[PDB]
Amino acid sequence: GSSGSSGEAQTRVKLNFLDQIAKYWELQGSTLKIPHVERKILDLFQLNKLVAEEGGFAVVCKDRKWTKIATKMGFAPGKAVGSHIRGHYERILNPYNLFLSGDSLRCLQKPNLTSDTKDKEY
CATH of the domain at 60: 1.10.150.60
Longest dimension (CA), the chain: 99
Q: Is residue 44 part of a domain?
A: yes
Count how many domains the chain has. Answer: 1
Closest C-alpha among 107, 64, 102, 106 to residue 85: 64
Q: Is residue 67 part of a domain?
A: yes
Q: Is residue 14 part of a domain?
A: yes
Contact 89, 66 (CB under 8 A): no
CB atoms within 10 A of CB 28: 7
What number of CA atoms fall less than 13 Å from residue 39's CA on the CB side?
A: 1
User: How far are the Cα atoms of 2, 16, 22, 25 from residue 5, in angstroms, in the given order?
Assistant: 9, 23, 33, 38
> Which residues are paired to 41 by β-bridges?
36
Q: Which domain holds residue 23?
A: 1-112
